[PDB]
Amino acid sequence: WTDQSFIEMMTPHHQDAIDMAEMALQKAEHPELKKLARNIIRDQEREIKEMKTWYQQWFKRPVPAMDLDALATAQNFDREFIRQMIPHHQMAVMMASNLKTNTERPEMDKLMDDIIRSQSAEIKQMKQWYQNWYG
């Protein structure tokens, strides 16, 4: 990944996670999942805003433009949320780790560190909840 291609892909990747998290505010069963959802929304919205600002600074143009149905209809919202969000988070951590070895920009080094750290911790939490709730 390059700084440009990362932002182009991570922007809608984040938006997908935010959309799923927004549904959780309505439909999550366990209060732990709603709390996670609020954190995802807060952090990933902030990161989209930063990436948008930087993209335009660096490239002098604006940033160019999962299964929500399956989530909405699942018997266990929380199970389906975790099923989809764990691999999604894993992909974000993968993208960030790769960009971190390619970039020279301190804005991006710090953002990658944040993505890797926060999303890895959220994966661990979701894995444990899944065992507790469904194992």
Side-chain angles (χ1 to χ4, degrees), residues 30-51 53-59:
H30 296 84
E32 296 98 332
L33 206 68
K34 282 192 180 161
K35 183 169 168 34
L36 165 65
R38 287 186 287 267
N39 291 342
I40 287 168
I41 291 166
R42 174 196 71 216
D43 296 332
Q44 299 202 19
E45 285 185 337
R46 179 186 65 242
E47 294 172 348
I48 284 173
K49 172 61 173 173
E50 283 166 13
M51 291 189 291
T53 295
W54 298 337
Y55 191 98
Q56 182 159 293
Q57 290 170 1
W58 300 337
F59 313 120

Side-chain angles (χ1 to χ4, degrees), residues 14-32:
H14 270 16
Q15 197 63 53
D16 281 349
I18 287 161
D19 292 349
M20 299 259 307
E22 283 287 344
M23 191 177 283
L25 302 187
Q26 282 282 314
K27 293 172 174 161
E29 304 163 275
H30 296 84
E32 296 98 332

Side-chain angles (χ1 to χ4, degrees), residues 1-8 10-16 47-48 50-51 53-56 58-59 61-65 91 95 99 108 111-112 115:
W1 298 95
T2 62
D3 302 312
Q4 192 193 313
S5 68
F6 179 93
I7 289 172
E8 287 166 357
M10 189 57 74
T11 299
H13 200 264
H14 270 16
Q15 197 63 53
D16 281 349
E47 294 172 348
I48 284 173
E50 283 166 13
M51 291 189 291
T53 295
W54 298 337
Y55 191 98
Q56 182 159 293
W58 300 337
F59 313 120
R61 38 203 190 74
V63 186
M91 179 66 177
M95 294 169 60
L99 190 269
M108 297 301 273
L111 175 63
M112 295 316 106
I115 290 171

Side-chain angles (χ1 to χ4, degrees), residues 47-51 53-59 61-103 105-109 111-113:
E47 294 172 348
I48 284 173
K49 172 61 173 173
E50 283 166 13
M51 291 189 291
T53 295
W54 298 337
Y55 191 98
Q56 182 159 293
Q57 290 170 1
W58 300 337
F59 313 120
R61 38 203 190 74
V63 186
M66 287 184 293
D67 193 333
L68 286 171
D69 279 320
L71 186 60
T73 63
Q75 161 66 22
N76 320 123
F77 180 91
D78 293 11
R79 179 202 291 278
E80 182 63 23
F81 182 95
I82 292 168
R83 190 192 69 79
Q84 297 199 40
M85 295 279 283
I86 284 170
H88 199 258
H89 266 45
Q90 285 172 322
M91 179 66 177
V93 173
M94 193 113 58
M95 294 169 60
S97 301
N98 174 262
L99 190 269
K100 183 173 167 68
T101 67
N102 280 290
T103 191
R105 300 185 181 272
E107 299 96 321
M108 297 301 273
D109 188 55
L111 175 63
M112 295 316 106
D113 285 341

